Amino acid sequence: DIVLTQSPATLSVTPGDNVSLSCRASQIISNNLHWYQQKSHESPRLLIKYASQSISGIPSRFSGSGSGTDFTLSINSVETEDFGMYFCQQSNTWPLTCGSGTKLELN
Amino acid sequence: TNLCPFDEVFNATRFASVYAWNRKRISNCVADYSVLYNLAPFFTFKCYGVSPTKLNDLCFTNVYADSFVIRGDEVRQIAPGQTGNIADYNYKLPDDFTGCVIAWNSNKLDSKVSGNYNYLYRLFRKSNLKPFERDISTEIYQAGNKPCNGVAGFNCYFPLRSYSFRPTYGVGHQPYRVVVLSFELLHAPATVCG
Amino acid sequence: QIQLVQSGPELKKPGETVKISCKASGYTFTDYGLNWVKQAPGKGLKWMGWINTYSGEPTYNDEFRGRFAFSLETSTITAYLKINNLKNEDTATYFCARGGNWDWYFDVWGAGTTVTVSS
Amino acid sequence: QIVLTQSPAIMSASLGEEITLTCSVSSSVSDMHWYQQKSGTSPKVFIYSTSNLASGVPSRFSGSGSGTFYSLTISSVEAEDAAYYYCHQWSSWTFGGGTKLEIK
Amino acid sequence: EVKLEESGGGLVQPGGSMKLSCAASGFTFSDAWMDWVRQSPEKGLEWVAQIRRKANNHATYYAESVKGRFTISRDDSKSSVYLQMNSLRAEDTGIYYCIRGMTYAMDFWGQGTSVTVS
Amino acid sequence: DIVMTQFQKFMSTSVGDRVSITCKASQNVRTAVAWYQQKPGQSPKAMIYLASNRHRGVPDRFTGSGCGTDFTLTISNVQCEDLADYFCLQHRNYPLTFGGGTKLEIK
Amino acid sequence: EVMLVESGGGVVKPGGSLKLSCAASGFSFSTYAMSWIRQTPEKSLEWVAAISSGGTNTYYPGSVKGRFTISRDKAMNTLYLQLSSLRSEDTAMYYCVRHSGNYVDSVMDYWGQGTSVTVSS
Ligand SMILES: *[C@@H]1O[C@H](CO)[C@@H](O[C@@H]2O[C@H](CO)[C@@H](O[C@@H]3O[C@H](CO)[C@@H](O)[C@H](O)[C@@H]3O)[C@H](O)[C@H]2NC(C)=O)[C@H](O)[C@H]1NC(C)=O
């Protein structure tokens, strides 16, 4: 499969910061990665499709970067309402598989 | 002991269309053809130049592997010698070819109930295709004394019609993915052997 | 209004079969798939495999090859994940998410079915 | 979408007529088969890949053509050929409407 | 399937006017170069006029023998093409066919209207 | 303007022969030549568009090619109902015209 | 010699289920695709089901999908098609038909006498 190492798995950040994530692959996945978040015991929501493009419904501050194999989710101006765990799920080869979870708490 | 990526080219999600067929260059293998041989649903598994059963101990130097998506009927044209719409204007094999032509039946994977218009094919060219040559020239045939500046209409025709692929069509018009292995032996020490 | 309601929690014994509904609502049912994804507590997601909603043929993962079955009926819009011979280590949370037939990103999800088996 | 039409549905021949059964296709298909149904029995095969012949039929049927037209030509029909002639290609889900060959 | 309809088999004294319609069916009217030709036994077949696609501003071209005396106008709402001719003589006598498109695929033709002059 | 000369108004062949309907032009038109038949008492059809390809729904006995200033059409194994009038057409410049006509009759 | 006699059809009210069967005799069964071809009383054939050689691929047209499940047995050298959720558009004579290759690509060589299923009353 395409194992997706998400390091680091947790972040101890303060409000009002600019934070960076990471979803580094093993095989080359040309911009066919999507990103998810999941809070405490709910259903996950969609954040960005095809590794850079945004969707309405979420705030416009969310921005997806990186292409090729290296992908970082950079969100700035992080406020209180974004507690949870963040996923990355590729789509290129088969079977589809998701990352081991990147959780986001607040100091 | 690096098994070379047939998995990047066989069970992939979105095969490209036939007018721009992607060409993966497989090299530095220990290639295991025992992983694709154990499959019932192959529509065609014809090989030329080598008998398909004993592919293991036949050392090549480069193994090119192509991919596209065509109709179920036109898998007949991916063959040395036959001409038509696909082997003349989209993807032409030479008549000394030394590889295998593998198909599928992907109607569940590559066709929605409405028009899946993401696959294109070429309708004409000013000359026939040289073997293994791809053209992404999406420029309107002028065909008259008037220049028409890239908007089609009368006397100015677009060179890429679209596939539709609805699953109520047929077993010959639902889309059949095709991967073409191509073996070759250009004058270099051995590289691909399992 | 486009949501995917599910069943409630279940509580079975090892060996019983289990049945989980996933009813669609609002969108045209034959325009997408229904990817089924299992989330164990304390782990990440695992795509168990999908189902074409027009045809009715599953495609399981190589992990969950046997011991599962994606059935389908289109009179009442509903997919099923029909496990036979439940075991112990699959105490999890089973979603159902509407990923397309050309895209494969799960955007519209369901609230979550929980099958904790015990004695 | 493939729709196969035959033109027309009833065709007159006498014992010494030459006759052509047409089977036009909407799109372009490679080959086109043919079958014969005498009434009360089951249809059997006559012509596969537009040019060959089945085992056991006489050498009076021969077809040709490609693209969007396929035609079955009988040179000299006799009394055995009064039945329905269905044309069908692999890629349709349906058959032709089928022409009848009634004797003059 | 696509069929074309046309009307107005008429007799006019020389010096009149004549506008005929072409209602269509079965295909997308908003992209088709629906043209017009003329049959007469003294002329063979002549080319009359044209109105082009929606994306090319309904670009219009006429034959130089009838410049000014004629006009064309399509409307994609009612799926119609109208061709109006004014101040005719004995030259413009003959059957006028109604074309879906010329010189490509989808080359379906109408059935003509018996248009004459006195 | 661009005129087409059809110099054989009557070609006379019978069944099983080979016919060559002709159409001479004024100057060099590239490939923009059409070919129409007209069964007696009806509206014409499209036999060949752009002087190389043939239409969807006509047999493979109706075939034609050529480039330059002269064009023609070849009929192989002419049957009992390919008996009609034949016209060629240019569409290089917007002054368009047909040929003159060609009437077949079986001997 | 190659022959096919079929059995199992009859009369059924709308909404019922049936199981047509196809007996094969004379050829090797495991290397030839087979398929069913129905004939409505307007005498116009069509496909209703099509199976491959290994029994993995199954194809049905868009009118009848999800309610006809063709199958193919190996151990007793037979063939099954079972019907479900009949309307009044499936009243037809149903032929069991053998292809000529390992796929549905080939031509339909040898047919059976067929079974008569007419939904009635
Ligand atoms: C493309 O992906 C599919 C998965 O959807 C691969 O199919 C699966 O491949 C695995 C590994 O080759 C097979 O597992 C093996 O099964 C045998 C028994 O058949 C067992 O003895 C082995 O230890 C191993 O577990 C699996 O059966 C197979 N499943 C299916 C349905 O084919 C496929 O191999 C991939 N393509 C390529 C070229 O690898």
Side-chain angles (χ1 to χ4, degrees), chain E residues 37-39 43-47 50 52 61-64 97 101-112, chain F residues 1 32-34 36 38 41-46 49-50 55-56 87 89-91 94-100:
Chain E
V37 289
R38 178 187 290 173
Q39 183 173 345
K43 305 292 178 67
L45 291 178
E46 290 185 355
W47 185 95
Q50 171 169 356
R52 219 194 282 183
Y61 295 95
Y62 302 100
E64 286 83 3
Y97 294 105
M102 294 180 86
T103 74
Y104 206 55
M106 304 295 174
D107 204 299
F108 208 92
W109 278 49
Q111 287 306 287
Chain F
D1 288 331
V33 179
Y36 293 162
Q38 189 184 47
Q42 283 83 11
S43 65
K45 297 162 56 60
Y49 71 102
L50 272 71
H55 197 265
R56 271 153 156 86
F87 317 116
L89 177 140
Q90 52 92 15
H91 56 278
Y94 277 148
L96 266 77
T97 186
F98 286 79

Side-chain angles (χ1 to χ4, degrees), chain E residues 24-42:
Chain E
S25 177
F27 79 108
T28 168
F29 203 90
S30 195
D31 39 357
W33 40 85
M34 287 196 48
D35 299 342
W36 275 82
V37 289
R38 178 187 290 173
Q39 183 173 345
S40 181
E42 294 86 11

Side-chain angles (χ1 to χ4, degrees), chain F:
Chain F
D1 288 331
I2 311 299
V3 82
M4 317 294 279
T5 294
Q6 207 171 354
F7 57 92
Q8 277 159 327
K9 286 183 64 70
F10 300 100
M11 192 152 294
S12 182
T13 55
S14 307
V15 178
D17 310 338
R18 178 185 295 276
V19 200
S20 297
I21 310 299
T22 74
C23 165
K24 272 198 59 179
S26 300
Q27 52 93 21
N28 188 82
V29 292
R30 291 307 190 278
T31 38
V33 179
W35 268 116
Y36 293 162
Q37 93 169 6
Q38 189 184 47
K39 45 188 189 308
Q42 283 83 11
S43 65
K45 297 162 56 60
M47 293 299 107
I48 280 176
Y49 71 102
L50 272 71
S52 64
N53 311 102
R54 88 184 68 93
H55 197 265
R56 271 153 156 86
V58 300
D60 296 323
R61 316 187 305 263
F62 289 75
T63 175
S65 62
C67 177
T69 197
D70 293 332
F71 300 92
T72 194
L73 175 64
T74 61
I75 310 176
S76 178
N77 192 21
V78 51
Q79 315 287 332
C80 275
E81 291 296 325
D82 300 326
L83 189 67
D85 267 336
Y86 285 65
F87 317 116
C88 65
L89 177 140
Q90 52 92 15
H91 56 278
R92 177 66 152 176
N93 300 5
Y94 277 148
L96 266 77
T97 186
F98 286 79
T102 300
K103 187 59 175 179
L104 280 84
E105 210 176 54
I106 311 297
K107 306 145 52 182

Side-chain angles (χ1 to χ4, degrees), chain A residues 94-95, chain B residues 6-7 10-12 32 34-36 38-39, chain C residues 47 59-62 65:
Chain A
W94 271 13
Chain B
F6 290 132
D7 187 81
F10 265 94
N11 46 28
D32 216 8
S34 163
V35 70
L36 79 153
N38 311 339
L39 264 190
Chain C
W47 179 64
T59 310
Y60 320 104
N61 198 294
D62 49 47
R65 199 146 68 253

Side-chain angles (χ1 to χ4, degrees), chain D residues 2-3 5 7 17 22 38 46 49-51 56 67 71 75-76 95:
Chain D
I2 289 298
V3 280
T5 52
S7 309
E17 182 69 26
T22 64
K38 296 182 185 180
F46 274 182
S49 297
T50 71
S51 178
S71 47
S75 83
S76 297
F95 272 46

Side-chain angles (χ1 to χ4, degrees), chain B residues 83-178:
Chain B
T83 61
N85 287 317
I86 292 300
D88 285 334
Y89 306 137
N90 307 271
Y91 184 80
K92 174 56 165 294
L93 282 80
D95 51 355
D96 65 327
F97 176 68
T98 318
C100 300
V101 180
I102 315 164
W104 278 276
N105 195 315
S106 86
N107 196 18
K108 52 191 290 186
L109 182 51
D110 221 353
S111 176
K112 319 198 304 168
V113 73
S114 67
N116 174 83
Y117 298 113
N118 283 127
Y119 292 95
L120 303 174
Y121 69 110
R122 195 173 290 276
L123 217 62
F124 40 84
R125 204 180 187 243
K126 208 58 178 70
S127 180
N128 287 129
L129 273 189
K130 300 282 302 177
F132 298 121
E133 187 148 4
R134 168 214 309 115
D135 46 348
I136 321 102
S137 167
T138 171
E139 187 67 25
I140 290 95
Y141 186 25
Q142 190 191 5
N145 192 19
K146 271 293 301 309
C148 52
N149 66 84
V151 50
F154 185 83
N155 212 1
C156 289
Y157 317 101
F158 195 76
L160 292 177
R161 294 269 300 272
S162 180
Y163 282 138
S164 56
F165 298 149
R166 294 192 188 94
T168 179
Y169 279 167
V171 192
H173 277 179
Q174 67 191 32
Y176 277 31
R177 303 163 151 207
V178 160

Side-chain angles (χ1 to χ4, degrees), chain B residues 37 44-53 55 97-102 181 183:
Chain B
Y37 210 96
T44 189
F45 199 42
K46 303 177 184 307
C47 294
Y48 319 105
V50 62
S51 66
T53 59
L55 275 163
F97 176 68
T98 318
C100 300
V101 180
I102 315 164
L181 288 169
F183 314 134

